[PDB]
Structure 1
Amino acid sequence: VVDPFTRKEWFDIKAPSTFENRNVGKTLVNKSTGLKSASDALKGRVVEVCLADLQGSEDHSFRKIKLRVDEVQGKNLLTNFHGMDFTTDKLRSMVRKWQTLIEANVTVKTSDDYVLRIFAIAFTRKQANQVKRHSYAQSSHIRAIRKVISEILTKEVQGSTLAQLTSKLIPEVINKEIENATKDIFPLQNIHVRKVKLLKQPKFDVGALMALHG
């Protein structure tokens, strides 16, 4: 007999305070014993949590958020930002025919060494009183738009470091700034970043995450 489910500890997860309610959920690993036990084997965890779960607003039901466990004290797993991406059903909802898709991408680092790749998506818009059925762009508007996206995203990163990058990523204010900067070139339907991925990270920096948590 082994019955492995009787030697687990039921730890708890805490989000970083650049969100609403810190309660995420529960985890469990193994009994702490000799020979390099689970004091560190519980470190490398990533939790997928809905942004509506983290903010209590139903209209954030997409944009699922990564949270990476970085340090553990007591019965508490402190997590930091690890990435973001849209939900697949939301993506397939935006991507429809008789319109042009613009997908831009940048790789930039914040004030600290948080190098990270920001994506972005947009779709051309059928304006009012449009008899025309498709409303495609001219591949030069597309290039101009993608240039503006890259400029804006690089402007928003490498200043306003990761903590307040998340704090302004939550209310969807960046894509509004795209809406202002690109409304003169070509109308658009759905501007989003659609994904943030962290590439590599600096030294552990215990103070940053003890600053976020508490």
Structure 2
Amino acid sequence: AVGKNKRLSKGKKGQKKRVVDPFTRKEWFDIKAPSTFENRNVGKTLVNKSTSASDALKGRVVEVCLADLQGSEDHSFRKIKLRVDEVQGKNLLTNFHGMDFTTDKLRSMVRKWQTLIEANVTVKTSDDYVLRIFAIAFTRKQANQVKRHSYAQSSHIRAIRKVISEILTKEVQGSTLAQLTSKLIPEVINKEIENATKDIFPLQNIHVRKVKLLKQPKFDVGALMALHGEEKGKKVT
């Protein structure tokens, strides 16, 4: 309420005058994604020009939908987090930071008259990257089923959780973080779980609900350059 009848406030007494457009000193910066993604171009960001600029850039986290990175609407419904790690000539070299799905779906999949199964595991990659994985799967009815619901016994639930628990540990331990992301895009992890859990009970909508990055090793620029696949200056004549 900027109206006149709106009563005066104490804070209104002291008002710093606006003497700078902050974006006069801002400078744009272009983000690039790791090589595992098809579309490396993922936009740009802005920071105050160095008096340094790199400090504010390091540790920056950008979240984006997979569809933009893979150019497929079969990934319009998944989201990835990328963190800035290295800066070179206005280009940002990022590394995978996390993955999560959109809220609207999680409401969409969750429906009445079945059982919700969730499993979680804490595990480290071969790169000493400690991550936490969340997996979601639902029971389904058979083709000739006549019962209205498809509830599964808790003994089955514990059996399914163990199978989901053991498997998720297997891939993460026997793979690197960059390799681990490479499996996420073709959603390969889900289809084992269907097959491994196939005999126990028929499931549906099997997904790795979320991925969290708990701990990171000592940073290695040499590795990061490899994941992204130096430059002499111009003389002031």
TM over 0.5: yes
| Alignment RMSD (CA, Å) | 0.8
Per-residue CA distance 1:129-183 (angstroms, 9 max, x = gap): 2211111000011000000001110001111111111111110111000010011
The CA deviation string for residues 18-61 of structure 1, in whole angstroms up to 9 with x for no partner, is 1111000010010110xxx3221111211111011110110111
Quick one: distance in 1 between partners of 2:38 and 2:177?
17
Q: Distance in 2 between matches of 1:205 and 1:182?
A: 39
Confirm or deny: 8 A CA contact 1:63 1:194 kept in the other structure.
Answer: no
CA distance, structure 2, for counterparts of residue 70 and residue 62 of structure 1: 26
> Given the alignment of the two structures, is residue 25 of structure 1 paired with residue 43 of structure 2, yes or no?
yes
> Higher relative contact order at CA 8 Å, sep ≥6: structure 1 or structure 2?
1
Q: Distance in 1 between matches of 2:218 and 2:187?
A: 30
Q: Which one of 183, 186, 210 corresponds to residue 168 of structure 1?
A: 183
Runs (4+) of structure 1 exceeding 2 A deviation are: none
Structure (1/2) with the larger strand percentage: 2
Output the CA distance in 2 between the equivalents of 1:154 and 1:62. 25
Using the alignment, how far apart are the partners of 2:57 and 2:177 within structure 1? 24
Separation in 2 of the partners of 1:191 and 1:87?
Answer: 15
How many residues are matched? 210
Cα distance in structure 1, aligned partners of 2:211 and 2:135:
9
Q: TM-score normalised to the size of structure 1?
A: 0.96
Check conservation: 1:115, 1:200, Cα contact below 8 A.
Answer: yes
Gaps of 5+ in 2: 1-18, 229-237
1:49-88 per-position Cα deviation (integer Å, ceiling 9, x unaligned)? 1011110110111220000000101010110000001111
Secondary structure of the structure 1 residue equivalent to 2:217: coil
Cα deviation code 1:89-146 (max 9, x no counterpart): 1111111110000000100001121000011000000111221111100001100000
For residue 165 of structure 2, the aligned residue among 150, 153, 160 is 150
Q: Which residue of 2 aligns with 1:12?
A: 30
Gaps (5+ residues) in structure 1?
A: none
Which protein has the larger Cα radius of gyration, Structure 1 or Structure 2?
Answer: 2
Matching residue of 2:104: 89
**Alpha-carbon distance in structure 2 between the residues aligned to 1:209 and 1:78:** 8
1:190 and 1:68 mapped to 2: Cα distance? 29
Distance of 2:54 and 2:214 partners within structure 1? 26
Q: Secondary structure at the match of 2:205?
A: coil
Counterparts of 2:169 and 2:59, CA distance in 1: 29
Report percent identity of matched pairs: 100
